[PDB]
Symmetry: none
Subunit: 173 residues, 2 copies
């Protein structure tokens, strides 16, 4: 299968991410590289990238996916809301039915290691989900400000990546 | 936190650096100044310097770090091998455990923008790592002769500096 994969957020200027026990922008890139590795072990062809500095970063992220035909376009994020010791958990966002197929599979896998918030339809008109040619999903891996979520994530990054890849490819790796 | 920073190499005579798409001695100084700015933005007390001409430049570099107590002493370098279009990447050198703490954090940050060559223990008897009072690291930011490395570096110098500062201070800036 062909997969486009992008890390959410820029590193400076407009578009930077959230921070708590972990830094979203940094971990989006660390986890991307691990997901690429696991996707390739599953036999997929992967087109990955990131945008570190640009006022046009949203369009540039979509251009990474749109440069070539792919079966699915995936963007990695981490969530935020309020600092808590409690588990908060995982959700995967889609806009339309074609992305929902993948969002449900990825969320089912991540829900075995994080609290299940479910696959979720886009309620904020996210540019990534409306400007890619391929079916698109946005993974909110876990909350940067949950101590329980991040305690698990920091010690199991390779497992998080494997589960994402297994959900995308719909198979065990 | 208190940080001592030095730019690698002299500008003439004994001790000059490498050249490729960028000039190491020049960029060590440019990037040093950016790292100082980002470290100060992160709340650190910073002592920096360089040695432009001296046959005794190694001892003089260490004296910049040793003049006052600091938590970590950092020297900036760029790597070299052969001229290539391909990525070559980043590594940070330490001698002992107390520097390894910082080297691993700096390398983890720089590996989100450059190919990851790793935090590495010194097998070459670097004077800088052996003659500093404080824990010490030597950052080989990227390769001067890699077009891919320098293409990113030249366009993102502030981001390179921010990532180094975040690795040293262990927090988001
Ligand atoms: Zn985000
Ligand atoms: Zn050097």
């Amino acid at each position: 299968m062909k997969v486009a994969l992008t890390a959410g957020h820029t590193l400076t200027g407009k578009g930077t991410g959230a921070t708590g026990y972990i830094n979203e922008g940094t971990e989006n890139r660390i986890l991307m590289d691990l997901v690429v590795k696991w996707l390739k072990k599953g036999g997929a062809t992967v087109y990955s990238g990131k945008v570190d500095k640009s006022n046009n970063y949203l369009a540039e992220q979509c251009q990474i996916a749109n440069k070539q035909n792919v079966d699915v376009a995936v963007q990695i994020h981490f969530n935020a809301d309020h600092t808590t010791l409690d588990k908060m958990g995982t959700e995967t966002i889609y806009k339309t039915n074609n992305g929902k197929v993948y969002a449900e599979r990825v969320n089912e896998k991540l829900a075995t290691i994080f609290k299940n918030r479910g696959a979720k339809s886009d309620a904020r008109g996210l540019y990534w989900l409306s400007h890619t040619k391929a079916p698109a999903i946005l993974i909110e891996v876990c909350f940067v400000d949950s101590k329980a979520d991040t305690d698990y994530y920091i010690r199991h990054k390779d497992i998080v990546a494997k589960l994402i890849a297994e959900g995308i490819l719909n198979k065990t790796i």
